[PDB]
């Protein structure tokens, strides 16, 4: 794979340096593969990034009892993200089933900006 | 910045193609900056990735009342990640204050592998 990338780059532009270039290309490919893996796990919902607490009452929010999961179910992933004010009751919002991290980033960008 | 990277790459190895190479370098730099931004936000704790539910009783786990937050506090981030079995009580584990995403990745890798 690094050889193909080096050949493509040389074609576009047109002994230990070649080894260093191949190592750099391999590191970049590994980083891109890590990004793709994180995006794929985000798509499957295996990244449980917490949705932000809405500012107003929403159908999503509810008590922790809204977090019902099966008795037989042995999932390691938390079903909801909850906050318990010293001022009131436990408020829980379910984690998105897909694109939880991307949805959180969109919510955070919308709120901050 | 792309010009410096192109010069460094040419030095290591030693008109529209130059523009395409500069655009590719700029895209790679933007992607690396996005990675650095995500890592930085992970360090500050602004990414609320849920820790996995422990298999045994742990000091971390507790009811939603363990999720106490200040009455004056108006934080948009959920304090805990909770699951409510149909079989028992609401179990809540606090989100790590720092490196929540990295800690979740470590926990997920340890559990899966």
């Amino acid at each position: 794979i690094p050889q193909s990338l080096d050949s493509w780059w040389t074609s576009l532009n047109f002994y230990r340096w070649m080894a260093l270039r191949r190592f750099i290309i391999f590191l970049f490919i590994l980083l891109l593969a890590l990004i793709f893996l994180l995006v794929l796990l985000d798509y499957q919902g295996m990244l449980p990034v917490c949705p932000l607490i809405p500012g107003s009452s929403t159908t999503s929010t509810g008590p922790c009892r809204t977090c019902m999961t099966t008795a037989q179910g042995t999932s390691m992933y938390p079903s909801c993200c909850c906050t318990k004010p010293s001022d009131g009751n436990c408020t829980c919002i379910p984690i998105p089933s897909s694109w939880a991290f991307g949805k959180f980033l969109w919510e955070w960008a919308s709120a901050r900006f | 910045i792309p010009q410096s990277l192109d010069s460094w790459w040419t030095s290591l190895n030693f008109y529209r193609w130059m523009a395409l190479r500069r655009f590719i370098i700029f895209l790679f730099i933007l992607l690396l900056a996005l990675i650095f931004l995500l890592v930085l936000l992970d360090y500050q704790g602004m990414l609320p990735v849920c820790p996995l539910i422990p298999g045994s009783s742990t000091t971390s786990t507790g009811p939603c009342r363990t999720c106490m937050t200040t009455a004056q506090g108006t934080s948009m981030y959920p304090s805990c990640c909770c699951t409510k079995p149909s079989d028992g009580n609401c179990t809540c584990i606090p989100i790590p204050s720092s490196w929540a995403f990295g800690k979740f990745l470590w926990e997920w890798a340890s559990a899966r592998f």
Partner: antibody
Amino acid sequence: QVQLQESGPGLVRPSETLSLTCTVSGGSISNDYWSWIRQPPGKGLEWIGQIHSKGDTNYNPSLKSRVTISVDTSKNQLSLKVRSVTAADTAVYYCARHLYRYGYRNYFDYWGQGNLVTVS
Amino acid sequence: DIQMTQSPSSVSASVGDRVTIACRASQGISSGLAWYQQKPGKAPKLLIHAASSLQSGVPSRFSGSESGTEFTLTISSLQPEDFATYYCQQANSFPLTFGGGTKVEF
């Protein structure tokens, strides 16, 4: 704007079940915590109990578990049943929606008009 | 049960006066106190929540201070529509309890 309106009798006989209803218009009775608070005539407010549509209900221990609160999401209704009332149950009852400020709060921002029930 | 005491039981004030109403919790409520205003024959109106956060639409002349366990509601200028009964609620623990009510008179 959420509009709470109480309904029910005002001549509940002693040693009888006190039934009250609170119809919520202009909104949804789900998604919020709703409490019943009673005020005896000339006395202070006394919180009877809260309930959420998707959760459990909390009651005042001073009522000795003779009070049941329910939610009818189909009718947007909030029902209160105070069993075995005495002359002390003569009071104005309010259904109150709980404040929500980045989480459910135990404060009552919207109140019903209040229905006076006399036990005699 | 958190006992919620109010002081005084009645305040004799005129228009344009600095009116103070004190509330005290039997045990610390972590600034989980609210102030409600109730007029004769009307439902209470939530004035302040969390002992310092003014309610939306409430005039800014109302203020809430939380010095220790002793909370205070302050009215800078007592308008003629401000003569009512003021209740303090604790929200930290269940059951939620109100104060005895401070009736601000003429």
